[model samples]
Target: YLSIAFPENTKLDWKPVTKNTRYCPMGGEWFLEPGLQEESFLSSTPIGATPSKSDGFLCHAAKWVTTCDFRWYGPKYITHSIHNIKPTRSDCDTALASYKSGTLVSLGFPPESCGYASVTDSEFLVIMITPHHVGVDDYRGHWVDPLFVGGECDQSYCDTIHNSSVWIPADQTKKNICGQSFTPLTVTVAYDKTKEIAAGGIVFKSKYHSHMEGARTCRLSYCGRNGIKFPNGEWVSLDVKTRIQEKHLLPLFKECPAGTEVRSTLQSDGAQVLTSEIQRILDYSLCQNTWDKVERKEPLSPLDLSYLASKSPGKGLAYTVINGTLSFAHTRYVRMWIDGPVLKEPKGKRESPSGISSDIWTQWFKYGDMEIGPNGLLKTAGGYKFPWHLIGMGIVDNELHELSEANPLD
Candidate 1:
């Protein structure tokens, strides 16, 4: 479940056309928008090989076998990034005003194309909507790290080092725009300069979202006003309990009020509350801007599938990192699970889970619970019921949706 809206810093007023969905004029193609989500694909995957034989499921292999036969952590349900565009100058008065003011035409990913997934070092999984694009306040026209954004850079940093092109290195490649070097550790996600990138512009894309059971996620550290880099403490670790036991599906039912509900039961559970809040924040979170405020602490190195396999037997769990930790283009989302079967299907078929496995996984981890199956599905040694059926069905960002709507006047 998810909700999306324009951050307060976005200069515009939004009008809601649907539940959990809205639009803004100044937003144009860059407007904050959210989409209404009601439908989902009831799917699951059956693991053919046991852990004794295979350490982990290959994402590519699982995707090939699904054949529309849904599976937990299958590749079929991958959601794409949401994109939006502005109306023509004649469609709405506001659009004409924007056109007169030299407002550049804006475009964003579509609701059908806004999804991504990831696995942390400890095998923790995450998924996000609209991971491809991000919005950023580039100081009204800052040209630092502008290599890919059209500006030329040093000969060493060319685009094609391996062959007959510019030598954009592996780690340092594609990290800047306009080729103007800057010293900022990480860029605050807030731009849709993808087209500009193709037009000789560079963009700060997200790479931290991809991990395979890594030990700890660390970035080069810098202290406030000191520029101090700690050699030992640079790694700010997140508390990721080893295990993929939780599973549940959280469904955002209505656009109005932007609320969430658990399909397993009618009574509102903890999952419902948390999901509702997450969805509501799409357009109304007081801390909506928080996505870029601090360096979010995610699970340990996830891409290290080998590490997760080593620990899976001890807990009878498997980690399936769906996708998460994206901030660019103002469209970010996250999904993760442990214990239950990981959805390893093709990205297209992973839309919604049949049961509440995703939801179950999230609740269990949030509260440190163990075991599965109860009123909530997953149980704990302390006799607490960890609802495991609350998986996320889909998400909608209103501010982005409206901007993408077709303009009648145009």
Candidate 2:
């Protein structure tokens, strides 16, 4: 240490330098690069410094996409598929005011599955890709598996071999396109409700004919019996024109018009799926650490500890933190109506400590604001601005204890 240049602005949370003392010196976004992955790291020397095998510890400082807020968080405990579409329900998902676009489409989990846990119900989840796709086999309609099998058919299938199959990315030697009298193969499927998935593939029987047409197959929604309609995948046709156009274009939407499925484009349908486990970081012991207060957690007994009972969250992602480190998935729609005690720090500190208030102030008003609108409409889903990404984690002890067992969404 010949001459120190920059002032030592970092005050390390130093512990006795031992094998257990594994942490960053001053906390920068430190992590292991895939190239430099090793077992145990006790410290980090980062930012333009070359890594070495000799250093006892290694932590690469890089930018972090982390979120931190004063308000603690809890998991959102609500089934995605909505069984009850009662208009009288206060928190029912009303259609968005207008259209905006993104990926992250919503899909429904099968109601037949997960009925016991009540995790899958009338509440719509619509995330990831559920097999809500329809398959247009004959002129009739039926809901089928999400997978398809047909690909680029060369000249042999069509004369010019205009790909007439559903375009499953087929084999070259095998006539994979549809011509007249077309009959590619039938598919088989098996379901798994516990995991909410399926396993199946194509059953083979390859042959073709310059086929005639039946009433056009229902690629989207089909109605075989009177008004009983369902979703289906694309059906291959003898006509090359049909194959090229029906090149499984509808699969891009996968708009399975099943029960409780929202009917709208991604722009209009602003829905996201949030499935996460709950953790009660606020054990009676974690909050107050004084030796005398060691038994404080005992009085709060009969208070069962919280743990994550695995859940099936479809697509949307969010996380929040509590007395421990709570997190949430996407918070696009939660207009802060959450309540907590107010703090009383009118003294010498501009930055008051969290969890010490008891006056009046909601979590909504703390960091963000959702201005009221005219027609009783609020920017709960779309407009409320500023620091929209993270929820605040500041909280009182009772708030932490109560939220440890509660659903933040409710």
Best candidate (score: TM-score)? 1
Q: After superposition, how far is residue 228 of candidate 2 from its true place, in Å?
A: 14
Give the C-alpha miss distance for residue 302 in model 1, angstroms. 32
Highest lDDT, which number?
A: 1
Please give the RMSD to the true structure for each candidate, in Å: 32.7, 35.0
Candidate 2 lDDT, 236-259, residue by residue in tens: 212112111224212322222444
Tens digit of lDDT per residue, candidate 1, span 299-343? 322222112111100111122222322111222222232223232
The lDDT per prediction is 0.22, 0.19
lDDT of 1 at 228: 12
Q: What's each prediction's TM-score?
A: 0.15, 0.14
Candidate 2 global TM-score: 0.14
